[PDB]
């Protein structure tokens, strides 16, 4: 059975107006800005941008890659597919 999300979990994450995007739940580094309540810091592969999302926008990677894990025209998307499949826990800073 599922647990709550924790840092390191891999997902496709959904923002209004973008397709479901390869992403991970980030840690919050010592001293770094914290998210709001009930939200997680989402690092988006490819773009390397962060946003704060709640679980309704987070689709676990193993379950959803058959559907969402396909090439896309948007900037950073296909780079993001490589990262999530090949080195999802690297430093991309």
Curated annotation (Swiss-Prot):
Expression tissues: Widely expressed. High expression is found in heart, skeletal muscle, ovary and testis. Overexpression is frequently observed in hepatocellular carcinoma samples.
Function summary: Acts as an epigenetic regulator of myogenesis in cooperation with DPF3a (isoform 2 of DPF3/BAF45C). Associates with the BAF complex via its interaction with DPF3a and HDGFL2-DPF3a activate myogenic genes by increasing chromatin accessibility through recruitment of SMARCA4/BRG1/BAF190A (ATPase subunit of the BAF complex) to myogenic gene promoters. Promotes the repair of DNA double-strand breaks (DSBs) through the homologous recombination pathway by facilitating the recruitment of the DNA endonuclease RBBP8 to the DSBs.
Name used for this protein in its record: Hepatoma-derived growth factor-related protein 2
Full protein: residues contained: 1 to 93 of 671
Organism the protein comes from: Homo sapiens (Human)
Signal peptide (residue range): none
Quaternary context: Interacts with HDGF. Interacts with trimethylated 'Lys-36' of histone H3 (H3K36me3). Interacts with trimethylated 'Lys-79' of histone H3 (H3K79me3), but has higher affinity for H3K36me3. Interacts with IWS1. Interacts with H2AX, POGZ, RBBP8 and CBX1. Interacts with histones H3K9me3, H3K27me3 and H3K36me2. Interacts with DPF3a (isoform 2 of DPF3/BAF45C). Interacts with SMARCA4/BRG1/BAF190A, SMARCC1/BAF155 and SMARCD1/BAF60A in a DPF3a-dependent manner.
Location relative to the cell: Nucleus; Cytoplasm
Family as reported in the entry's similarity comment: Belongs to the HDGF family.
Residue ranges constituting the PWWP domain according to the UniProt record: 7-64
Residues that span the membrane, as ranges: none
Domain of life: Eukaryota
């Amino acid at each position: 059975m599922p647990h709550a999300f924790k840092p390191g979990d891999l997902v496709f994450a959904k923002m209004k107006g973008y397709p479901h995007w390869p992403a991970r739940i980030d840690d919050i580094a010592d001293g770094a800005v914290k998210p709001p309540p009930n939200k997680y810091p989402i690092f988006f592969f490819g773009t390397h941008e962060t946003a704060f999302l709640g679980p309704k926008d987070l689709f676990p990677y193993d379950k959803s890659k058959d559907k969402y894990g396909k090439p896309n025209k948007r900037k950073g998307f296909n780079e993001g597919l490589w990262e999530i499949q090949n080195n999802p826990h690297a430093s991309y800073s």
